[PDB]
Symmetry: C3
Subunit: 959 residues, 3 copies
């Protein structure tokens, strides 16, 4: 029986004969799906190998051992490959090809053969691969062997098997079946330029996330990938279907008609008419319709409608034809040559037969001159000798014709050209008004003359059907982008798809206030947020779940009316702030960028005005302001400081930051890992301050801020003890120097553990350089579009300006030059403007970083939550590509404790207040402690002052 | 008043320019990654908006809460602090703000909805009131309000005895001033100038955006079918290219000024976070930064896409 | 700035080309100078920020 199995990762071929190295190139072509239900075939007693159609195109593989498959038959010219005992021959009998006896080379299974059959645009590509191998572990790139311009289509292929005859037994055989449909793979090339993986953008949500990120390792986070829209389903065509009604009673069921010369002309206008009446009645047999096609009457409508009623005889109907003349034709009525009219004929014997005899018809016979078209004569009369002995074909026949005319007046007569849908995201078309949305009830009452209402946003919001008098509300149908909830591949592999404000009734499964969510099960509990999902939804892995973002550490403060709690401990938590102080300054030659060495390009471009010059001026301003930012950020001091050759800093270890004399490039480990982690027509100008000089300024700034304190920003550096300096910094954050004095070595120990955690976090944190890498990505992608918009082949025969010149006359070749250069110049100008705004943002950030350097490093900042979280102490710089990294010291308190405090001790009528401390008790003794730390001190007459009496202090006590 | 958020949006470039027209989409997709630049710049705007919102409101990961027993010793903050009896947990001042203030594109919801922003503001108030400024630097170290204001007067150069003799009178002055704030916000159309105008700027920015689609540029019909039916296909293609490139330039220009306000209000919101640090999360020595004059105290309040303070 | 116009100023286009095509070429200069104006305004906004 046929068997089904997973195709896994087979079918990866190079698209053409173009080699690419170390690129993640993604291209669109006919490709075979991944993880497909590939049928397994076996031949054993039974023989089930029916005809295998070609369809669009077939990827076929043969797991061949001992060369049992020898050839096939291709035909509907037909393609065949034959291998006799000598060599291998390829035959198409238009197309011929000779290659190698590969299939004869043939150099339990020891080998596996691989084949490719591709047939588009008359080019037939085969890739050959001998793979010496329940699937054995291995892989092979599909080498491009041959391309043959067959120019033929073969709509079927067959399978041939080899038996053994002297009994006879048919061996077990298998083959693989798949087909190519246009999709877009994503590749990877290793150091040796070989494919190791291919992922389409259209198999999996994981696959398309990979396609978007262009990186096969994913850290974590919510990524936007695509959009969701509800596609329309039906075509709605609406017109005056019912409404009024056209006059047909006196046209068809009128009792009496008129004579030809006095033919009745009447106006039919502004009425609803249906064409199905004549079509659905049998007697109206003859419908040969002149000048205008009756099928397209649903599209074309004339100015007005005329219905002429008249009576003619039988034998002279044949005489009415073009190219002939006669008495009746030249003196009664001459038909138009361009007659755009439509005729109806039927039997009317009951309406034409009279027993008493019809002798009341008159007509005008004598005329002085020939009648002209669209003319009437009223300026001699014969009676028609009609007799009942007339033949079957000579009896009078009634014909009624509708006549239409074309004039300058607008078409005032047009009929309906239908059904009304309800409550579906489909098209609504009311007299030419198109749209897309849902149709719901409308609570708003219009006025009878008003049809189309609008909202504030100047959009169609309400509509009423021209035939059915109901007001409807057109709410926009569900709209939302496709964003993927997928954590790092190091943790999971499942995907989750989110829909921004869209109900899944248009697509376990969970419905949120952002719509419906597919791929996670909602959790009613509260957990700390990790990745924001939307509208207060966050995910935490403990599979993929989504829950309303818990606020965080939900807590109720223990407000006290008479008691205080002050921390007795803390931590020096040190973090990283990364501020990009510069960017990749660029200066672009306009003429080079557009055409370079093209004389005509250069001459015809430089006369287009000062565009290139002004853009270059803007870029030069950009470059000089990066140089200025570097000046303001780094070179705020002109006296080059160097630490003494002894790298001793009072027990504080700084081995990972100082410049190292061992390395000739003066490169610290932190900037080492930063360098490792960071990643024609392009111009990069070297920094005015190279990495070496930037590092030297960092060294000098450190020398100042450690050895000589914060004075070096005010001129010459003033030598000052480092721990008295840090005591001053504690004083600046409201902490007494005794805290540092009695915590000297231990605070050193926490400082060392903190810097070690810093270096570990920098080493193991791929997101620490996120902003810098982000700036680099802007630079890169801007350059990519900037360059690629010119030399893109786009799969045409030739994309050469000289090719256009050779294929066109010079007058229009110059026009093509103009169009091309204008397009490229506009693209460049857009790039430059984007660069300008990015530069302004970087300029703001750079002023920010200069302020950080000045107020966090060259001195202490009391401005909380600018130089790091909490009361900020001091900071350290370090170099970074086009940027800088600042390490901050912050006093973060911990280990809070309630304490028994007194407002005033009323002794001898005096209420006692301190300048800075708070009086507290441990239970048996009363001590004074400061604001941001619990530090008891002796309460004497010296260290306290009496201000006010006891009748104003809240909390009178006796002690 | 400081604008904080904007009506963040992401524009499907193809849907914007063309709609569901397969011909227009096929034409447009060959014009390069300008659309990708547009979308990704807008995504940068959105993530910037969310991170400004987080810096402004989720400055503390730990969420302190106001007890129903609001025993402040006679300092009633009912109009700023949402009442537990009030169903949707929003301040009356927020209600005044909200009822005072007033396709093919999207509006993304804030990560912190109106309720969650209000809750963040409530946590900030609880910290800065019951526990004072230290909750920015760590745990909300509880500290009684009269002595917290005594610390503030020691900040501006006043002894705590002066407060204790003046506690009742400054309380009455403060509550009367709060009443004046209530009346001024209720009756003052110019009280919300900055937020109302930034909401405007977003609004008529989007409005000129949508009317740009109504800029005909001299053709017969913006739907491609009429152009093809009444014109030769070769010239129809070129006119299609002209119209779509005009609209593409318009969208690029719109997002250009959108980035311009992105930077502007980003700096403003940085200032807002800085002044919650210096004004809510502590005392500022800065002049003309927590309002006019020496600073004493501040109370943040939620607002549509922005914040409002009573310094 | 020529902007692909055989004459760079409006009155000279009027004098040098018949009105039916002079109007369209004037339109082309109008949109080019418009581009220039938006560029200048964007520089103005950035500088003023
Ligand atoms: C304050 O906290 C620090 C750590 O946060 C404490 O330091 C630790 O003290 C214990 C007690 O002997 C030692 O075993 C640890 O080795 C210390 N840590 C380190 C990194 O060395 C300190 O003792 C605390 N002080 C008070 C008064 O509570
Ligand atoms: C400080 O720690 C570093 C870490 O490697 C060590 O090399 C150094 O000897 C220690 N002591 C001093 C005084 O730097
Ligand atoms: C102080 O005591 C109260 C009593 O309920 C308790 O809730 C609070 O956590 C205590 N605070 C400290 C810092 O010990
Ligand atoms: C409180 O501290 C004092 C001195 O620091 C000490 O003498 C006393 O014993 C302490 N109280 C208790 C209950 O131990
Ligand atoms: C404070 O204001 C509220 C609301 O305006 C009012 O109900 C209350 O009586 C006022 N006074 C106190 C002490 O709460």
């Amino acid at each position: 029986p046929p068997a089904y199995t997973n195709s896994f990762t087979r079918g990866v071929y190079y698209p053409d004969k173009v080699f690419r190295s170390s690129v993640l190139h993604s291209t669109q072509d006919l490709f075979l799906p991944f993880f497909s239900n590939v049928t397994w075939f076996h031949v054993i007693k039974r023989f089930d190998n029916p005809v295998l159609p070609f369809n669009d195109g077939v990827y076929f593989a043969s797991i061949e051992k001992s060369n049992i498959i020898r050839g096939w038959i291709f035909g509907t010219q037909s393609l065949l490959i034959v291998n006799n005992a000598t060599n291998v021959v390829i035959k198409v009998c238009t197309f011929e090809y000779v290659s190698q006896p590969f299939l004869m080379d043939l150099e339990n299974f020891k080998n596996l053969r691989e084949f490719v059959f591709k047939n588009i645009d008359g080019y037939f590509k085969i890739y050959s691969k001998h793979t010496p191998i329940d699937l054995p572990q291995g892989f092979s790139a599909l080498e491009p062997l041959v391309d043959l311009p067959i120019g033929i289509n073969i709509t079927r292929f067959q399978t041939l098997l080899a038996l053994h005859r002297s009994g006879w037994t048919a061996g077990a055989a298998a083959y693989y079946v798949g087909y190519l449909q246009p999709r877009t793979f994503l590749l990877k090339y290793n150091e040796n330029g070989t494919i190791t993986d291919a992922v389409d953008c259209a198999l999996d949500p994981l696959s398309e996330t990979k396609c978007t990120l262009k990186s096969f390792t994913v850290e974590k986070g919510i990524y936007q990938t695509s959009n969701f829209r509800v596609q329309p389903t039906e075509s709605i065509v609406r017109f005056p279907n019912i409404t009024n009604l056209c006059p047909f009673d006196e046209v068809f069921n009128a009792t009496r008609f008129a004579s030809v010369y006095a033919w009745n002309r009447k106006r039919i206008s502004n009425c609803v008419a249906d064409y199905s009446v004549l079509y659905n009645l049998a007697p109206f047999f003859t419908f040969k319709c002149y000048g205008v096609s009756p099928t397209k009457l649903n599209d074309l409508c004339f100015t007005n409608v005329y219905a002429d009623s008249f009576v003619i005889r039988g034998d002279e109907v044949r005489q009415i034809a073009p190219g002939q003349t006669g008495n009746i034709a030249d003196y009664n009525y001459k038909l138009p040559d361009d007659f755009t009219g439509c005729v109806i004929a039927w039997n009317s014997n009951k309406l034409d037969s009279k027993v008493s005899g019809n002798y009341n018809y008159l007509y005008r016979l004598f005329r002085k001159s020939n009648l002209k078209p669209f003319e009437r004569d009223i300026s001699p009369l014969r009676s028609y000798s009609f007799r009942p002995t007339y033949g079957v074909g000579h009896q009078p026949y009634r014909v009624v014709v509708l006549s239409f005319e074309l004039l300058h007046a607008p078409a005032t007569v047009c009929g309906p050209k239908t059904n009304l849908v309800k409550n579906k995201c489909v098209n609504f078309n009311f007299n030419g008004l198109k749209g897309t949305g849902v149709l719901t009830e409308s609570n708003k009452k219009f006025l009878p003359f008003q049809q189309f209402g609008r909202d504030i946003a100047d959009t169609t919001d309400a509509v009423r059907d021209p035939q059915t008098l109901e007001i409807l509300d057109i709410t926009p149908c569900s709209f939302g982008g496709v964003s993927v909830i997928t954590p790092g591949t190091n943790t999971s592999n499942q995907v989750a798809v989110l829909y921004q404000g869209v109900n899944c009734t248009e697509v376990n499964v969970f419905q949120t206030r952002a719509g419906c969510l597919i791929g996670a099960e909602y959790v009613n509990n509260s957990y700390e947020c990790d990745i924001p999902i939307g509208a207060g939804i966050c995910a935490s892995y403990q599979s993929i779940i989504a829950y309303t973002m818990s606020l965080g550490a939900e807590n109720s403060v223990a407000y006290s009316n008479n008691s205080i709690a002050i921390p007795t401990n803390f931590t020096i938590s040190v973090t990283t702030e990364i501020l990009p102080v510069s960017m990749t300054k660029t200066s672009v030659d306009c003429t080079m960028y557009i055409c370079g060495d093209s004389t005509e390009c250069s001459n015809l471009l430089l006369q287009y005005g000062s565009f290139c010059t002004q853009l270059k001026r803007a870029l030069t301003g950009i470059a000089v302001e990066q140089d200025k930012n570097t000046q303001e950020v780094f070179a705020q001091v002109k006296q080059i400081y160097k630490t003494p050759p002894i790298k001793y800093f009072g027990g504080f270890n700084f081995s990972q930051i100082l410049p190292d004399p061992s390395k000739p490039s003066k490169r610290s480990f932190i900037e080492d890992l930063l360098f490792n982690k960071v990643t024609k027509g392009l111009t990069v100008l070297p920094p005015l301050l190279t990495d070496e000089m930037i590092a030297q300024y960092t060294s000098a700034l450190l020398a100042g801020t450690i050895t000589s304190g914060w004075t070096f920003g005010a001129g010459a550096a003033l030598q000052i003890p480092f721990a008295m300096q840090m005591a001053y910094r504690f004083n600046g954050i409201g902490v007494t120097q005794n805290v540092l004095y009695e915590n000297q070595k231990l605070i050193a120990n926490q400082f060392n553990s903190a810097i070690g955690k810093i270096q570990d976090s920098l080493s193991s944190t791929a997101s620490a350089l996120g902003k810098l890498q982000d700036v680099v990505n802007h630079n890169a992608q801007a350059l990519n579009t900037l360059v690629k918009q010119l030399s893109s082949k786009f799969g045409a025969i030739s994309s050469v300006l000289n090719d256009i010149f050779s294929r066109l006359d010079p007058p229009e070749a110059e026009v093509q030059i103009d169009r091309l250069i204008t397009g490229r110049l506009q693209s460049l100008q857009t790039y430059v403007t984007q660069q300008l705004i990015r530069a302004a943002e970087i300029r703001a950030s750079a002023n920010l970083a200069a302020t950080k350097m000045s107020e966090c490093v060259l001195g202490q900042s009391k401005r909380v939550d600018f130089c790091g979280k909490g009361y900020h102490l001091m900071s350290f710089p370090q170099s970074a590509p086009h940027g800088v990294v600042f390490l901050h010291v912050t006093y973060v308190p911990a280990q809070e404790k309630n304490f028994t405090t007194a407002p005033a001790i009323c002794h001898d009528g005096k209420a006692h207040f301190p300048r800075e401390g708070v009086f507290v008790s441990n239970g048996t003794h009363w001590f004074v402690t400061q604001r941001n730390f619990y530090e008891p001190q002796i309460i004497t007459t010296d260290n306290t002052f009496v201000s006010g009496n006891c009748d104003v202090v809240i909390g009178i006590v006796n002690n």
